[PDB]
Design a protein around this ligand. Structure first.
Ligand code: BCL
Ligand code: BCL
Ligand code: BCL
Ligand code: BCL
Ligand SMILES: CC[C@H]1c2cc3[nH]c4c(c3C)C(=O)[C@H](C(=O)OC)c4c3nc(cc4[nH]c(cc(n2)[C@@H]1C)c(C(C)=O)c4C)[C@@H](C)[C@@H]3CCC(=O)OC/C=C(\C)CCC[C@H](C)CCC[C@H](C)CCCC(C)C
Ligand SMILES: CC[C@H]1c2cc3[nH]c4c(c3C)C(=O)[C@H](C(=O)OC)c4c3nc(cc4[nH]c(cc(n2)[C@@H]1C)c(C(C)=O)c4C)[C@@H](C)[C@@H]3CCC(=O)OC/C=C(\C)CCC[C@H](C)CCC[C@H](C)CCCC(C)C
Ligand SMILES: COC1=C(OC)C(=O)C(C/C=C(\C)CC/C=C(\C)CC/C=C(\C)CC/C=C(\C)CC/C=C(\C)CC/C=C(\C)CC/C=C(\C)CC/C=C(\C)CC/C=C(\C)CCC=C(C)C)=C(C)C1=O
Ligand SMILES: CCNc1nc(NC(C)(C)C)nc(SC)n1
Ligand SMILES: [Cl-]
Ligand SMILES: [Fe+2]
Lengths: 237, 281, 301
């Protein structure tokens, strides 16, 4: 009967499709690893997918996945148990070392480019025409930590030019330098900017950017990692 | 085993209950207190379903069906074989679902991410509880709830729906459907778009999000943007489930007739109600 | 409380993006529209520009002729009375020809002929638009995933309106043009074919419809939850994985024992949705042509 043939056929197709989908979703992070870093004997029922190449725009090279994987950065963690399945504990300052919820990934130390190859994220002072169109303008407002103390004042907004959204607030500290605070980690209010994640005295530990008019992907990761990491590691304060 | 990049994230912390006592993983799975709770609740209900299938006399999953108490039982407990098994499986399901949510929250805290996923899953739970708890209670009996069986719950949807004529005419069912349809539309497009940018034509460099935006603008005169589309998908799916829950919570409690009759508020309105012609004149 | 990134705190506005050029023919691209602050709280404020080429104008023309045909028929059922038109807007129906006419195009205007005309115009409008989703992607150098996914929606519509009615020997089997009448047609269709719940292709279709809401809730929430690490910038996370992509993946690995990648979640997504209408189309195609009664069929096979 043709309907029975069709339903049975479709179920075969669907198993084929699920197999395809799971292997496509093994292009990052595989092969699996023992907690000591060596390859795990158990890699699952699905095989590693055959590698694929992306050609990055603007002469930025090519990425092949899956491929030779490393975190090219030291991980300041130690094993908590002989056997597998237990937490690995920070050996140092987890926030300054980039571990747990403070983690960052060794992305390219270059800025994301828009379609025409200009920097995607620029401070508003370097971005002709850009202004606050609605909601409270945060420039000039004080910045306040979870300890309720002032960390600095907002001197600019860093904007995703192509998407026209505020991504960071640039914040001047008492010492005169500045840092970037992710927009999604601040609550802008009528008389101040609150930052639940960090005490005032931890804003300086926010990683600093090499150039004052651009930010690399590597820097963004360190900044967002450090700042999210305070929800857990600055919490006792 | 671990993903190649996972180790640096498997630190202690983020539990809500039990401190470090349950702060470990089994294989890929994070445990926590709510993982042991999930396991306990799920184990008991699975077992209780097994008992229910021995009583009914079958092992075929297509046949197994655990019915709620008959309506005559109101909101009292019932004997195991005559509805009580369903009531305890329903308690277990709710505990397991809620514990899964709270476990999700613990994982959120350890990974230092927002709580949007369990918040969202909670709408699914509120839909289950609507059909299983809120609506049955408002109507006065657990027997108004749905049976736990693969095909018998379908028969329940059919019977419940046909009690009010064509359930298509439920106004909140309509809104709900539009959200479901619009969500599938949206997901197909978002998957397509991202994938069409990352996997461009042969002989071409990976596209940028500016191409994504340009594509939607060319096609439709508006791009909602990367943040926006994920905002939108979450809103469409969530709104679909809210209006599903709403369209049932008002059925049998504040509405009792065939749902097509609701639409006289527009038709039989006194001024044009009597004008000759049209469909209703 | 923290803040959730559902609505924007501060909107930011700059020079309008005119878009990528690539091989897009700029002559067919319009001027930029106005900015909507209302929209800018939830997504981008920019309206326009929009591209209209040979095929888009054709699509819009056939689509307006479709709406105008249904419209003129609706006014006729209303006796040219504006009061009646508004009150029975949803009850009006432009029905296909009766079964007596088979697949003939020789039905009188007021007994199915106009339905056939409306259908012609809708057919040109949808296929014109499909060719257009392809062409807009081609001109930008993008893959054709959008047009391929859209074929899946088109296939359900093609079966309901055209392939199935033809296979059954009469236009009377197609869907009428009305709000309520199409609902009634859908209920009558399940009743006549012996409960569509028991069509395993309806059940799969529902699995993927529900599953499409499951997966977009899961993915929408996920990406917003990692937006503090720039996770919504999905394309750059695919080219150079960030802690956003890693945390998202680990959330799910630790929750359900497996996970996706930034790229692969969008394949799960495109297939979850596409399958809705692909399966559903098979189930309708098979109804009446092959299986008269789904419940009955289901108890034997
Ligand atoms: C799938 C099975 C049925 C069917 C069952 C339903 C049901 C059930 C409902 C709809 C509803 C709608 N249907 Mg229908 N609908 C069908 C075929 C169609 C066809 C077609 C054949 O091309 C069209 C154009 C529509 C169009 C519509 C909309 C007017 C309305 C909201 C849907 C939506 O949000 O879209 C996506 C949104 C965009 C913005 C695009 N339906 C088939 C025949 N349709 C809902 C409604 O409100 O009816 C009054 C509703 O509850
Ligand atoms: C003949 C039948 C009637 C009818 C009668 C009903 C009735 C009765 C109901 C619906 C409801 C719905 N109908 Mg209707 N419906 C009809 C025709 C249609 C049509 C159409 C094209 O004709 C459409 C699109 C719909 C669409 C819908 C949805 C809007 C809604 C179901 C979604 C939902 O509630 O999810 C919500 C999701 C859940 C409840 C899932 C909960 C999941 C839980 C939390 C997790 C489970 C975990 C699991 C156990 C673990 C597995 C373990 C492992 C992984 C192994 N109906 C016809 C006209 N319809 C229902 C509704 O709105 O209910 C709220 C409802 O009660
Ligand atoms: C929402 C409105 C109605 C309803 C109306 C319908 C209709 C109509 C249909 C279904 C169908 C299904 N429904 Mg239902 N269903 C309801 C409530 C539920 C509940 C619940 C606890 O709330 C559950 C678990 C299910 C589960 C299911 C699946 C068995 C099946 C495919 C759905 C799917 O993939 O969704 C999306 C989810 C995923 C893709 C994730 C995977 C979920 C898996 C597949 C669920 C397995 C359930 C398992 C057997 C339950 C036992 C667990 C154990 C004892 C360990 N329904 C309510 C009462 N349901 C379809 C079917 O084919 O059934 C015969 C179908 O046509
Ligand atoms: C009593 C009624 C029957 C029933 C009879 C039917 C029938 C009949 C059908 C369905 C179909 C479906 N039903 Mg059912 N269905 C019932 C009960 C349910 C229940 C439930 C009770 O819980 C659920 C969850 C569902 C769920 C579903 C869906 C999975 C499926 C539609 C998928 C879709 O996306 O269509 C929406 C998408 C489309 C129609 C694609 C069309 C896209 C076109 C090309 C766009 C044209 C737009 C046009 C140009 C104008 C607008 C453009 C503007 C400019 C914006 N049904 C009851 C049991 N159901 C359909 C199916 O596939 O069956 C297997 C179908 O034909
Ligand atoms: C609200 C928007 C949509 C949504 C969202 C959503 N669902 C979610 C989530 C989110 C955000 C999760 O984070 C969570 C998840 O982890 O997914 C991978 C989940 C989830 N959604 C799931 C299923 C699901 N969601 C559904 C729907 C939806 N989910 C909505 C449309 C549906 C249906 C029917 O449409 C189903 C079937 C699970 C995969 C998962 C929750 C897993 C879980 O709760 O684990 C703990 C419990 C068990 C492992 C088993 C409990 C066993 C019981 C004790 C016995 C079974 C009783 C049951 C009531 C009988 C059912 C019989 C049926 C035949 C009717
Ligand atoms: C996976 C199947 C889902 C889906 C997918 C889908 N729909 C699509 C597409 C895709 C991939 C497009 O690329 C195309 C589009 O361009 O969207 C903006 C479209 C489209 N889906 C549309 C509507 C639509 N899709 C629907 C359903 C679905 N679309 C499914 C849920 C529905 C219903 C009834 O549920 C409707 C009403 C249009 C907005 C658009 C096709 C535009 C068109 O053909 O216009 C012709 C008419 C005029 C110009 C008159 C004005
Ligand atoms: C960008 O980020 C994202 C990821 O990561 C980068 C992802 O992983 C995912 C997660 C999503 C997927 C991996 C897609 C596949 C998942 C589905 C289709 C949803 C349905 C899921 C299931 C049916 C699996 C259910 C498994 C369970 C409940 C385990 C039960 C075992 C016990 C111990 C009990 C999303 C959403 C995401 O957006
Ligand atoms: C890059 C994100 N752009 C974008 N824009 C839009 N616009 C509408 C209005 C169709 C949702 N959609 C998507 S995916 C649906 N993506
Ligand atoms: Cl065109
Ligand atoms: Fe996405």
């Amino acid at each position: 009967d043709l309907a029975s043939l069709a339903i049975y056929s479709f179920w075969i197709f669907l198993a084929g499709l699920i197999y395809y989908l799971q292997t496509e979703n093994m292009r990052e992070g595989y092969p699996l690893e023992n907690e000591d870093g060596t390859p795990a004997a158990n890699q699952g029922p699905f095989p590693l997918p055959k590698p694929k190449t992306f050609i990055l725009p603007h002469g930025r090279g090519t990425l092949t996945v899956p491929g030779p994987e490393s975190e090219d950065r030291p991980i300041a963690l130690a094993r908590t148990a002989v056997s597998e399945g237990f937490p690995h504990a920070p050996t140092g300052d987890p926030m300054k070392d980039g571990v747990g919820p403070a983690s960052w990934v060794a992305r390219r130390d270059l800025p994301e480019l828009d379609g025409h190859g200009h920097n995607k994220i620029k401070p508003m002072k370097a971005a002709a025409g850009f202004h606050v169109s609605a909601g409270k303008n945060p420039i000039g407002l004080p910045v306040r930590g979870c300890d309720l103390e002032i960390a600095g004042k907002v001197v600019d907004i860093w904007v995703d030019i192509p998407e026209q959204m505020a991504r960071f607030l640039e914040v001047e500290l008492k010492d005169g330098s500045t840092r970037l605070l992710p927009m999604q980690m601040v609550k802008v209010q009528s008389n101040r900017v609150h930052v639940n994640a960090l005490s005032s005295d931890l804003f300086a530990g926010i990683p600093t950017i090499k150039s004052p008019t651009e930010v690399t992907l590597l820097e963004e990761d360190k900044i967002c990692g450090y700042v999210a990491g305070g929800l857990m590691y600055a919490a006792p304060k | 085993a671990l993903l190649s990049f996972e180790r640096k994230y498997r630190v202690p912390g983020g539990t809500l209950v039990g401190g470090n006592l349950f702060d470990f993983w089994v294989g890929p799975f994070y445990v926590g207190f709510f993982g042991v709770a999930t396991f306990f609740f799920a184990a008991l209900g699975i077992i209780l379903i097994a008992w229910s299938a021995v009583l009914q006399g079958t092992w075929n999953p297509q046949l197994i069906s655990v019915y709620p108490p008959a309506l005559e039982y109101g909101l009292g407990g019932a004997p195991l074989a005559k509805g009580g098994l369903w009531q305890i499986i329903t308690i277990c399901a709710t505990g397991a679902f809620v514990s899964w949510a709270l476990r999700e929250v613990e994982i959120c805290r350890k990974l230092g991410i927002g709580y949007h996923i369990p918040f969202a899953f909670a709408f699914a739970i509120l839909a289950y509880l609507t059909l299983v708890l809120f609506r049955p209670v408002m109507m006065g009996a657990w027997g108004y709830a749905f049976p736990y069986g693969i095909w018998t719950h379908l028969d329940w949807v059919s019977n419940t729906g046909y009690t009010y004529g064509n359930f298509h005419y439920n106004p909140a069912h309509m809104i709900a459907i539009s959200f479901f349809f619009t969500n599938a539309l949206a997901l197909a497009l978002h998957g397509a778009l991202v994938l069409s940018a990352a996997n461009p034509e042969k002989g071409k460099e990976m596209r940028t999000p500016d191409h994504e935006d340009t594509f939607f603008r060319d096609l439709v005169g508006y791009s909602i943007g990367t943040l926006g589309i994920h905002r939108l998908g979450l809103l469409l799916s969530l709104s679909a489930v809210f209006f599903s829950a709403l369209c049932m919570i008002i059925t049998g409690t504040i509405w009792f007739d065939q749902w097509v009759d609701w639409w006289q508020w527009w038709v039989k309105l006194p001024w044009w109600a009597n004008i000759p012609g049209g469909i209703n004149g | 409380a923290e803040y959730q990134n559902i609505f924007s705190q501060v909107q930011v506005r700059g020079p309008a993006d005119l878009g990528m050029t690539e091989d897009v023919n700029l002559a067919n691209r319009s001027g930029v529209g106005p900015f909507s602050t209302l929209l800018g709280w939830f997504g981008n404020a920019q309206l326009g520009p929009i591209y209209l080429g040979s095929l888009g104008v054709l699509s819009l023309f056939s689509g307006l002729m479709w709406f105008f045909t249904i419209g003129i028929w609706f006014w006729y059922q209303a006796g040219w009375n504006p009061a009646v038109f508004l009150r029975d807007l949803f009850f009006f129906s432009l029905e296909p020809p009766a079964p007596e006419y088979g697949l003939s195009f020789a039905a009188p205007l007021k007994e199915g002929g106009l339905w056939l005309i409306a259908s012609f115009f809708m057919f040109v409008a949808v296929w014109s638009w499909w060719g257009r989703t392809y062409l807009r992607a081609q001109a930008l150098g993008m893959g054709k995933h959008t047009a391929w996914a859209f074929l899946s929606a088109i296939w359900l519509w093609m079966v309901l309106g055209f392939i199935r009615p033809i296979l059954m020997g009469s236009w009377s089997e197609a869907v009428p043009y009305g709000i309520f009448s199409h609902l009634d047609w859908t209920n009558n269709f399940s009743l006549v074919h012996g409960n569509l719940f028991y069509n395993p292709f309806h059940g799969l279709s529902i699995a993927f419809l529900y599953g499409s809401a499951l997966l977009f809730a899961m993915h929408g929430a996920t990406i917003l939850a990692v937006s503090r690490f720039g996770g919504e910038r999905e394309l750059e996370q695919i080219a150079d994985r960030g802690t956003a992509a890693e945390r998202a993946a680990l959330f799910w690995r630790w929750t359900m024992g497996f996970n996706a990648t930034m790229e692969g979640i969008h394949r799960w997504a495109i297939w979850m949705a596409v399958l809705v209408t692909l399966t559903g189309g098979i189930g309708i195609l098979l109804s009446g042509t092959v299986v008269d009664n789904w419940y009955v069929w289901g108890q034997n096979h």
